[PDB]
Amino acid sequence: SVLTQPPSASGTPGQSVSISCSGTYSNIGSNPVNWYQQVPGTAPKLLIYANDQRPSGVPDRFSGSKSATSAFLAIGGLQSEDDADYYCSTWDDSLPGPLFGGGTKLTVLGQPKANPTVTLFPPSSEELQANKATLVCLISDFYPGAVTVAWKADGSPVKAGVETTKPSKQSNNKYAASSYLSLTPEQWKSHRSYSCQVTHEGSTVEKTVAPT
Amino acid sequence: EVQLLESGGGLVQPGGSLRLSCAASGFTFSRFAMTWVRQAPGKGLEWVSAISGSGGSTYYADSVKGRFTISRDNSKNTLYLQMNSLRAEDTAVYYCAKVGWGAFDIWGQGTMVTVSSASTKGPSVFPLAPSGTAALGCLVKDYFPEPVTVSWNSGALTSGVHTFPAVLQSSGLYSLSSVVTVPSSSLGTQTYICNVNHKPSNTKVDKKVEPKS
Amino acid sequence: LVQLVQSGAEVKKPGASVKISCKASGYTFTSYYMHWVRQAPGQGLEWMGIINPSGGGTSYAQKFQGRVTMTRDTSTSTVYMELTSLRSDDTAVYYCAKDRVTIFWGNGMDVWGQGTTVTVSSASTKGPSVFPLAPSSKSTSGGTAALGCLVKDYFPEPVTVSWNSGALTSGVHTFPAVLQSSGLYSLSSVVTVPSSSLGTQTYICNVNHKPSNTKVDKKVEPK
Amino acid sequence: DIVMTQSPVSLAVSLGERATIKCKSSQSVLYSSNNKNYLGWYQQKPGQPLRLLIYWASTRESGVPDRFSGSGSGTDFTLTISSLQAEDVAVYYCHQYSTTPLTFGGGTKVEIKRTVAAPSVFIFPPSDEQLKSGTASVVCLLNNFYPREAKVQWKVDNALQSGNSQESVTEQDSKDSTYSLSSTLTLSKADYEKHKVYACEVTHQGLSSPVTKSFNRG
Amino acid sequence: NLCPFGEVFNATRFASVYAWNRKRISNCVADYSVLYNSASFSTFKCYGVSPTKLNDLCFTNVYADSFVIRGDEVRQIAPGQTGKIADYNYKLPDDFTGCVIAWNSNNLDSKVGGNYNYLYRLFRKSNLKPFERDISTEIYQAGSTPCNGVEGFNCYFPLQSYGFQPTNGVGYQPYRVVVLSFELLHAPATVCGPG
Ligand SMILES: *[C@@H]1O[C@H](CO[C@@H]2O[C@@H](C)[C@@H](O)[C@@H](O)[C@@H]2O)[C@@H](O[C@@H]2O[C@H](CO)[C@@H](O)[C@H](O)[C@H]2NC(C)=O)[C@H](O)[C@H]1NC(C)=O
């Protein structure tokens, strides 16, 4: 019922990369797999159908494979014009229409990988006086431009009240992003500490603030 | 040769209804199944609905079953998606696509559909107080629509100014923050005022960002 | 039994288009390739492309890709070839030819249509002028005199020339026409006869140009 | 594109004797999957379409006389007529059907060889009827000569002409195997009245020295 | 006495890969280098045995499978491979003992307008087991909606045409393939090389 893709993938110019799509026996295991390439803002474009078949006009450096419950999109001779979001898609025996993975942002590296700088602001006195509370987590100077933001209060995950932007390119062609935690003044002061965790390229940078 | 040109996207109120159309060209339209796929901003793709080449069979995802109605007019080479009881979750770019050998092999350019309660509003500005460099700024909250411009000390401060792109919350209102990095010795003696202006609301706020006692 | 019959001659202005038909009989129409091959005047052969009557698929020579279109009407067993944006060097005889197979690029074209002449010219139809080529005492050589008449400034081809309404065939030489800078054709027809016959036998050239419905009987007299 | 080169351009053979024509392809047309050369031979007589003689280099088409045989492989191919007959006088084309575009050779004209025969030359001044029209056509006939190669040079008042003449030639005659040639020199009436002596100088194998036929305007 | 390999290799028509052909070779002598030494094969690859010495070994049986596929699929005719052909049409076992031979057949199997005679299986619910063969023509059902013998949104006829045309790139040109399976039994050896 869900197809899982890594949120990000990368490779240096001219090298290869393999984007995975993880499913179950009821979908990938029993149904044909398609892959789509979407340069953001433009429409998706079919790259692979029936597991490993190419529409006319798609170069053979794009290739598809499948195992028991996982599918893989291999891309050879990486070019910067391959920068895009790639989506796997298949059918499920239980569903009338096809499923899509969460997408994978592919970055053909044009500069060294840089981890994000994180700055976390607690709620202001003016906002609290207004019966509101917003935690502000600002993320900057990271590359490639893909992060995951996890909020936690007293070591427990906070999934409600979170709003996160998509990364956007800065002056220096690194990326910036921000995440907002909306709370009541009570729950802000009802915990010892809140934490903003930004995981980039498998490593997490953490910042915390406290009502105290 | 082949082309799918969509039309009809726009702003619509929660609970309202809207209809989209997809004009086809360059292939015999009646011989192929057609589908609608949508993508919420910053989200993945979601299959919405499909219809047989003749229109005698229709398919819907549970997230839209009952509210949306797919149809086609093979004499005019046009596909339709009638949407009813729209909710804010239905906000997304909507794509029309041709179906072939289990995949969607030809897509249209997409059309935007926004389901929002969004009366023009001015933002609330709160100081993000500073806590050998020091980072401070101001938060610009719950405003609509874009854009918002932020200055610092009436433009005399440009070194270290980082105005982050706004976030679009589930409420349909924008919020953003602009942060400046200044020297730690500068604090307690240099005055910092972030100037926020939202032309669509004629709102201008000057907020002094001071240390917190 | 097996035969291909093409449509008639065509005259076209530059920039126009021509559509030629090839009606097949005596064999299973859909079981063999059909080629189109053209031959410009005094030139070699130029293959234009193939159409597979079973399905109507085609493959054109790249030189013609864009302005040639081959179609087939299987209910009448007819193949069509259309060439558009005609230019003067499209003037040629166009042949339709049946292949021995429907594999790869064929394996020999075993049956050919009679061909279709197509003339591409800014010229309008014009009947010829017939001037005599008079025998003369200075021209006679050893009892043999050479005479004829010149069929000048006509369009298009062809012209027919007989002598004494067909009585005189021996020694006749009717030359292939040449195209002049004016865009009009011209050919000569000559005959050698005994200088004895001059004064006893009259010599008349019979010129016919049906495109203009022109008929001319010119008497070539000694000078 | 494949280029098909035929040798020779023209071949003169006596009746009953052997005719062999060569065709060279710029690229091999031999396919190892079936060991076949995608090479065909065709015959064309005047005013007729092509006639298939040989396909796959060596296989004779149904109804083709046994005296025709093709040989060769890869790029070098040969068409042989063991004993030439009168109905074999024609142009022969090779043709490759291995790659698009399917290209023909330039063709080889097979003719009957006969003894060298110098031409009878006749010159014709312009009719007075044509002169009224404003143009002067002067015709020079070379009759019943062999071989075909001949050169005609027009001299007006002993001034060699260039660009103002056109020629055509008959096919080989059925009876005597000779050729005939007409050369037409055309001038404006004004330029024709300007000069006196018009000459047609003929050069040919069967002539030890060029033959010139002249006339004085009158 | 002489194994009839000529009828296998020199056959006028080859089978579609989904309906791949098999011939049993038995009680004969195999002149393998009449095949190995030929430059007419763009692929001659052996597994579990050496291309050399092939004329010096003996087997209980030899199976000659043959079919037509696309040029860029020939790599799938080997042990340990995956893809449309290896998964859905013709599957070799991991421990395959034999030789795979292939050559370009564009001049025989291509056709202006596309050859419709050569087909492949595009959809299958499960992978083939080694040397399994599936010529079924049931409509393939993707998702939950039943097809009831008619194509549509989620329903596709499982076999499709290569449509070989002579102008195709070589990767999309047809290739004839011959797979020689060398079977070693605890039984009388009936197929023997000359030496
Ligand atoms: C497949 O056939 C080839 C060629 O066939 C030869 O030519 C045909 C026209 C026909 O006459 C066949 O009987 C011929 O064999 C075989 O290659 C030939 O093998 C013979 C000996 O059997 C040899 O004399 C030739 O030189 C060979 N020619 C070439 C081009 O290699 C080939 O052996 C056959 N395949 C198998 C598996 O036997």
Could you count the other beta carbons within 10 Å of the beta carbon of residue E169?
9
Where does residue A21 rank: exposed (0-12), middle (13-18), buried (19+ CB within 10 A)?
buried
Helix, strand, or coil (residue B132): coil
Rounded to the nearest 10°, the torsion over CA E125, E126, E131, E134 is -10
CA of E34 to the centre of ligand 1 (A): 9
Cα dihedral across residues E62, E66, E71, E72: positive or negative: negative
Angle, alpha carbons B195-B201-B203 (nearest 5°): 30
Could you count the other beta carbons within 10 Å of the beta carbon of residue B55?
16
Alpha-carbon distances of C5 from C24, C26, C99, C114, rounded to whole Å = 7, 12, 15, 7
A115 secondary structure, DSSP code: P
Q: Looking at beta carbons, which pairs linking B187-194 to residues 24 or more positions away fall under 8 Å? A: B187/B130, B187/B134, B187/B211, B191/B153, B192/B136, B192/B152, B192/B153, B192/B157, B193/B152, B193/B153, B193/B154, B194/B125, B194/B127, B194/B137, B194/B138, B194/B150, B194/B151, B194/B152
Give the separation between CA B101 and CA A48, rounded to whole angstroms.
Answer: 11
Give the separation between CA E50 and CA C115, rounded to whole angstroms.
Answer: 60
Element (H, E) at A189: helix A185-189
Is the bond preceding residue D126 a cis peptide, omega within 30 degrees? Answer: no
Element (H, E) at E85: helix E84-88
Contact in structure between C174 and C168 (CB atoms under 8 Å): no
D178 secondary structure, DSSP code: -
Contact in structure between B136 and B182 (CB atoms under 8 Å): yes
Q: What is the DSSP string of E88-146?
A: HT----TT--EEEEEEE-HHHH-BTT-BSS-EEE---SSPPPTT------PPEE-SSS-
Locate tokens 């293959």: which residue?
C47
CA-based nearest distance A95→chain E, Å: 5
With CB atoms and an 8 Å threshold, state whether E153 touches B33.
yes
Give the separation between CA B92 and CA B114, rounded to whole angstroms.
Answer: 7
Angle, alpha carbons C44-C50-C53 (nearest 5°): 140
Contacts of B213 (CB under 8 A, 6+ apart): none
Enumerate helices (H) and strands (E) in chain A, giving the number of each.
2, 18
Give the separation between CA C56 and CA E39, rounded to whole angstroms.
Answer: 37
Tokens read off for C119: 């003339």
Q: Give me the residue from B101, B126, B167 closest to A165, CB to CB.
A: B167
Contact in structure between D87 and C31 (CB atoms under 8 Å): no
Contacts of C188 (CB under 8 A, 6+ apart): C133, C148, C149, C150, C151, C174, C175, D139, D141, D182, D184
Helix, strand, or coil (residue B63): coil
Q: Write down which chains contact chain B via at least 3 CB pairs under 8 A.
A: A, E
Angle, alpha carbons A20-A22-A23 (nearest 5°): 150
**Rg of chain C taking only CA atoms, in angstroms:** 22
In angstroms, the first-to-last Cα distance of chain B is 69
Interface with C, mutate which of E14, E109, E112 (most C CBs under 10 A):
E112
A6 secondary structure, DSSP code: -
A8-108 CATH pick, 1.10.10.10, 2.60.40.10, 2.40.50.140, 3.20.20.70: 2.60.40.10
Phi-psi group of C159: left, alpha or beta (phi > 0 → left; psi -120 to 50 → alpha; rest → beta)? beta
Give the separation between CA C47 and CA C38, rounded to whole angstroms.
Answer: 6
Give the separation between CA C182 and CA C13, rounded to whole angstroms.
Answer: 15
D61 reaches C (C-beta below 8 A): yes
Give the separation between CA E48 and CA E79, rounded to whole angstroms.
Answer: 10
Tokens read off for A177: 């992003």
With CB atoms and an 8 Å threshold, state whether C112 touches D49.
yes
Touching chains B and A? (3+ Cβ pairs < 8 A): yes
Contact in structure between A68 and A24 (CB atoms under 8 Å): no
Interface with B, mutate which of A121, A166, A174, A183 (most B CBs under 10 A):
A121
Residue in chain A lying closest to B48 (CA): A97
Contact in structure between A7 and A102 (CB atoms under 8 Å): yes
Q: Where in chain A is the domain with CATH 2.60.40.10?
A: 8-108, 117-209
Contact in structure between E103 and E8 (CB atoms under 8 Å): no
Contacts of A155 (CB under 8 A, 6+ apart): A195
CA-based nearest distance B25→chain E, Å: 19
Is the bond preceding residue B145 a cis peptide, omega within 30 degrees? Answer: yes
Is the bond preceding residue D147 a cis peptide, omega within 30 degrees? Answer: yes
Chain D residues whose CB is inside 8 A of the E105 CB are 33
Query: What residues flank ligand 1, with Cβ below 6 Å?
Result: D 35; E 5-6, 9-10, 34
Could you count the other beta carbons within 10 Å of the beta carbon of residue C157?
17
Tokens read off for E157: 């006829």
Tokens read off for C205: 């050239």
Give the separation between CA B71 and CA B80, rounded to whole angstroms.
Answer: 5
Give the residue extent of every domain in chain E.
Answer: 1-113+166-195, 114-165
Chain D residues whose CB is inside 8 A of the C95 CB are 49-50
Touching chains C and A? (3+ Cβ pairs < 8 A): no
For residue A163, give the amino acid letter: E
Touching chains B and E? (3+ Cβ pairs < 8 A): yes
- List, in sequence order, the alpha helices (H) in chain D: 128-133, 189-194
Domain A117-209's class? mainly beta
Is the bond preceding residue C14 a cis peptide, omega within 30 degrees? Answer: no
Where does residue E60 rank: exposed (0-12), middle (13-18), buried (19+ CB within 10 A)?
middle
D28 secondary structure, DSSP code: -
Alpha-carbon distances of D181 from B24, B182, C130, C193, D202, rounded to whole Å = 66, 103, 19, 17, 11
In angstroms, the first-to-last Cα distance of chain E is 15
Q: What are phi and psi of E29, to 5 degrees?
A: -120, 130
Locate tokens 């795979």: which residue?
E100
Contact in structure between E175 and E104 (CB atoms under 8 Å): yes
Chain E residues whose CB is inside 8 A of the C56 CB are 113
Contact in structure between C98 and C110 (CB atoms under 8 Å): yes
Q: What are phi and psi of E135, to 5 degrees?
A: -110, 15
Chain E residues whose CB is inside 8 A of the B101 CB are 122, 156, 160
For residue E122, give the amino acid letter: L
Give the separation between CA B74 and CA B58, rounded to whole angstroms.
Answer: 15
Contacts of A160 (CB under 8 A, 6+ apart): none
Contact in structure between A75 and A82 (CB atoms under 8 Å): yes
Q: Which of C192, C185, C177 is nearest to C212 (CA)?
A: C185
Spell out the domains of chain C, with CATH numbers in brackets. 3-120 (2.60.40.10), 129-220 (2.60.40.10)
Residue numbers followed by a gap, chain B, C–N over 2.5 Å? 131
- List, in sequence order, the alpha helices (H) in chain B: none
Locate tokens 């330039």: which residue?
D106
Contact in structure between C5 and C96 (CB atoms under 8 Å): no
Could you count the other beta carbons within 10 Å of the beta carbon of residue C56?
14
Q: Write down which chains contact chain E via at least 3 CB pairs under 8 A.
A: A, B, C, D
Share in percent of chain A as helix, strand, coil (round to 5): 5, 50, 45
Contact in structure between B183 and B133 (CB atoms under 8 Å): yes
Contact in structure between C85 and C118 (CB atoms under 8 Å): no
Pocket test for ligand 1, best of E3, E8, E10 (most atoms within 8 A of CB): E10
Q: Which of E127, E143, E122, E139 is nearest to A91 (CA)?
A: E143
Give the separation between CA D9 and CA D31, rounded to whole angstroms.
Answer: 28
Q: What are phi and psi of D193, to 5 degrees?
A: -70, -15
Per the document, the length of chain B is: 213
Contact in structure between C58 and C82 (CB atoms under 8 Å): no
Chain E residues whose CB is inside 8 A of the C55 CB are 113-114, 116
Phi-psi group of D140: left, alpha or beta (phi > 0 → left; psi -120 to 50 → alpha; rest → beta)? beta
For residue D183, give the amino acid letter: S
Q: What is the DSSP string of C17-63?
A: -EEEEEEEESS-GGGS-EEEEEE-TT--EEEEEEE-TTT--EEE-GG
Element (H, E) at E160: strand E159-161
Give the separation between CA C54 and CA C51, rounded to whole angstroms.
Answer: 9
- Resolution of the structure, angstroms: 2.2
Give the separation between CA B60 and CA B51, rounded to whole angstroms.
Answer: 9
Give the separation between CA B137 and CA B127, rounded to whole angstroms.
Answer: 6
HEC sequence for D34-57:
CCEECEEEEEECCCCCCEEEEECC
Tokens read off for B164: 């982050």
With CB atoms and an 8 Å threshold, state whether B165 touches A99.
no
Helix, strand, or coil (residue A192): coil
Tokens read off for C152: 């000048």
Give the separation between CA D152 and CA D141, rounded to whole angstroms.
Answer: 10
Tokens read off for B113: 């559909």
Give the separation between CA B7 and CA B22, rounded to whole angstroms.
Answer: 6
Contact in structure between E116 and E14 (CB atoms under 8 Å): no
Element (H, E) at E8: helix E5-9
Strand E43-47 to C92-99 pairing: unpaired
Give the separation between CA E174 and CA E105, rounded to whole angstroms.
Answer: 6
Q: What is the DSSP string of C172-207?
A: EEEPPPEE-TTS-EEEEEEEEEEGGGTTTS--EEEE
Could you count the other beta carbons within 10 Å of the beta carbon of residue B117?
12
CA-based nearest distance C149→chain D, Å: 10
With CB atoms and an 8 Å threshold, state whether E106 touches C105.
no
Give the separation between CA E189 and CA D59, rounded to whole angstroms.
Answer: 44
With CB atoms and an 8 Å threshold, state whether A53 touches E154.
no
Buried b (16+ CB within 10 A) or exposed e, E90-99: bbbeeebbbb
For residue A161, give the amino acid letter: G
Give the separation between CA D105 and CA D94, rounded to whole angstroms.
Answer: 5
Q: Which of E79, E75, E101, E80 is nearest to E14 (CA)?
A: E101
Locate tokens 């411009």: which residue?
B149
Contact in structure between A6 and A70 (CB atoms under 8 Å): no
**Rg of chain E taking only CA atoms, in angstroms:** 18
**For A152, what's the count of Cα atoms within 13 Å in the CB-facing half-sphere?**
12
D164 reaches C (C-beta below 8 A): no
Strands (E), chain B: 3-7, 11-12, 18-25, 34-39, 45-51, 58-60, 68-73, 78-83, 92-100, 103-107, 111-115, 124-128, 133-143, 149-152, 161-163, 167-168, 174-183, 193-198, 203-208
Chain A residues whose CB is inside 8 A of the E123 CB are 32, 50
Tokens read off for B103: 């995949």
Contacts of A186 (CB under 8 A, 6+ apart): none
Give the separation between CA C119 and CA C9, rounded to whole angstroms.
Answer: 8
Q: Which of D175, D166, D176 is nearest to D145 (CA)?
A: D176
Angle, alpha carbons C67-C68-C72 (nearest 5°): 145
Tokens read off for A13: 């110019």
Interface with C, mutate which of E68, E111, E167 (most C CBs under 10 A):
E111
Give the separation between CA A198 and CA A139, rounded to whole angstroms.
Answer: 8
Could you count the other beta carbons within 10 Å of the beta carbon of residue B199?
10
Spell out the domains of chain D, with CATH numbers in brackets. 4-112 (2.60.40.10), 120-216 (2.60.40.10)
Tokens read off for C129: 């002028």
Give the separation between CA A143 and CA A10, rounded to whole angstroms.
Answer: 10
Residue numbers followed by a gap, chain A, C–N over 2.5 Å? none
